Design a binder for this molecule. Structure first.
Ligand SMILES: Nc1ncnc2c1ncn2[C@@H]1O[C@H](COP(=O)(O)OP(=O)(O)CP(=O)(O)O)[C@@H](O)[C@H]1O
Ligand SMILES: [Mg+2]
Ligand SMILES: [Mg+2]
Ligand SMILES: [Mg+2]
Ligand SMILES: [Mg+2]
Lengths: 28, 473
């Protein structure tokens, strides 16, 4: 699929590291 | 359509590879690198009012944007989208501060690890409307509106340990039916009533259950359908009882079934899916508008009703045809694409990355923004109007006076809030507080020509003295 190639072009590098590091303080 | 409303959005904030950054400093950099006037509180964190009438501030560990007061859901979409542009620009400007941090911002609601943050809707209502009716009629509406409002989420349960996809980011964080809380034990109906207006006339309904939406169609439907339901509640129009058994359990069960087949159990004995219950609210809203207005119905009310109905019909037929309109559908379309292309289980880290990066505010990296760039999402407003709304206020609320004063007399504004503007005039030992107590006064029709003719803040304050009950209340 064409749009999946565009998404592949912009995804963050080191996907597992990025996801594990996305840690937020609680808000409202 | 006419009802005073607004959206407050807390943004997720990431500063990778800066082991000595903290969320409060990073959030302050975003607010301070963009801008203006201080917020009138009468620590005090970074906290400013913009020339479009909006608030930009640090709410504990997140940068937050609050729209100016608007009167209809199209304008809510417009100034909310301006907030996304403001956040993206603020982060770009923060990269030029001496600290040099690369700050990423996400218009979403969770880190998928047990933390949630909020996108709140605010609606002005009659004080006379009995609160038990607000509760009884809104709980089933809020339990089910995620079928078009949901932004989608990979992971089941607050802690994300369960495998799978669900409709909403917020559902797993709601635990009770009614209450004051916004950060824990969250209630479907929040009961805080702080209207920043005449409390003998007005209630401000503070809604906390919605996901932040990227899609303009989703945000439009969220605010517009809710406003229609509020009109029916205020007028005592709903004679049915839509109450459901275990509404908190139902909210989560609806979210956890993206096939849209889960049946709610109503107290009156009926078994309806969330889409079916939404169709019951839509049918009542149609009868209400026909009964009340007949041919006097305005185009926007007609448009909200038509889009609500069309969306519900398409959800019941085949939800994937809404991939250009709804966030959870557009996101699921990407997710299932990768699942088929690469045979990934729902626990794959790439799927978590898609779930989060969908909401990245960068025009070049955020996945929703890439869908728009490639013409694959329907829009409600155009970018030129969004850019103007970053700097100019709505014309038909008191945000007009607030934003135009800041643009024209910024140097002499000591502070501002929703219900006043504080002037510091040359040669005065005292500050001049101009109350703006009515949300529908202080509009362009009220003060626009006066502001045009005034060349200094001293001239304006002079022309306004003793005229408070003319221009603003
Ligand atoms: N009379 C009114 N009626 C409806 N909406 C209003 C309103 N006055 C202000 N609003 C809107 O409500 C929102 C208020 O923003 P604000 O950030 O102060 O909310 P809040 O009081 O829930 C944050 P906090 O919980 O930290 O106090 C804005 O979007 C504003 O446009
Ligand atoms: Mg707020
Ligand atoms: Mg907040
Ligand atoms: Mg709020
Ligand atoms: Mg408040």
């Amino acid at each position: 699929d064409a749009i999946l190639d565009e998404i592949d072009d912009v995804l963050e590098e080191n996907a597992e590291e990025f996801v594990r590091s996305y840690i937020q303080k609680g808000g409202q | 359509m006419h009802r005073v409303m607004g959206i407050e959005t807390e943004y997720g904030i990431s500063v990778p590879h800066q082991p000595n950054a903290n969320a409060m400093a990073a959030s302050s950099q975003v607010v301070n690198a963009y801008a203006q006037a201080r917020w009138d509180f009468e620590l005090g964190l970074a906290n400013v009012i913009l020339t479009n009438g909006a608030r930009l501030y640090v709410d504990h560990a997140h940068p937050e944007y609050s729209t100016p007061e608007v009167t209809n859901p199209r304008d809510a979409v417009l100034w909310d989208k301006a907030g996304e542009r403001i956040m993206a620009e603020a982060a770009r400007r923060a990269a030029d501060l001496p600290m040099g941090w690369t700050i990423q911002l996400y218009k979403n609601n969770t880190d998928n690890k047990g933390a949630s943050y909020g996108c709140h809707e605010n609606y002005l209502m009659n004080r006379s409307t009995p609160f038990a009716d607000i509760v009884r009629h809104l709980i089933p509406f809020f339990v089910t509106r995620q079928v078009f409002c949901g932004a989608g989420r990979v992971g089941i349960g607050a802690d994300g340990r369960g495998e799978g996809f669900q409709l909403s980011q917020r559902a797993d964080f709601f635990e009770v039916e009614v209450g004051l809380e916004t950060t824990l034990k969250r209630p479907i109906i929040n009961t805080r009533d702080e209207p920043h207006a005449d409390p003998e006339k007005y209630r401000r309904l503070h809604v906390i259950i919605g996901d932040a939406n990227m899609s303009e169609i989703a945000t439009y439907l969220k605010l517009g359908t809710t406003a229609l339901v509020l009109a029916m509640i205020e007028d005592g129009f709903l004679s049915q009882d839509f109450s459901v058994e275990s509404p908190v359990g139902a909210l989560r069960a609806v979210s956890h079934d993206p096939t849209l087949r889960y049946q709610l159990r109503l107290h009156d004995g009926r078994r309806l899916t969330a889409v079916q219950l939404q169709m019951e609210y839509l049918e009542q809203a149609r009868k209400y508008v026909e009964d009340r207005f007949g041919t006097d119905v305005d185009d926007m009310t007609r448009d909200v009703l038509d889009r609500w109905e069309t969306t519900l019909v398409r959800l019941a037929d085949d939800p994937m045809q809404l991939s250009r309109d709804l966030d959870w559908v557009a996101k699921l379309s990407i997710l299932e694409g990768y699942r088929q292309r690469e045979n990934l289980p729902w626990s794959a880290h790439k799927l978590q990355l898609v779930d989060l990066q969908y909401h990245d505010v960068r025009p070049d990296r955020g996945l929703y923004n890439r869908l728009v760039a490639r013409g694959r999402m329907n829009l409600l407003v155009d970018e030129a109007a969004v850019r103007t709304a970053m700097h100019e206020p709505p014309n038909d609320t008191r945000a007009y006076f607030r934003g135009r004063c800041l643009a024209k007399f910024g140097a002499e504004i000591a502070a501002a809030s929703w219900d006043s503007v504080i002037f510091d005039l040359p040669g005065r030992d005292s500050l001049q507080r101009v109350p703006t107590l009515e949300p529908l006064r202080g509009t362009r029709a009220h003060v626009g020509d006066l502001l045009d003719r005034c060349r200094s803040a001293t001239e304006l304050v002079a022309a306004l003295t003793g005229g408070e009950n003319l221009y603003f209340q």
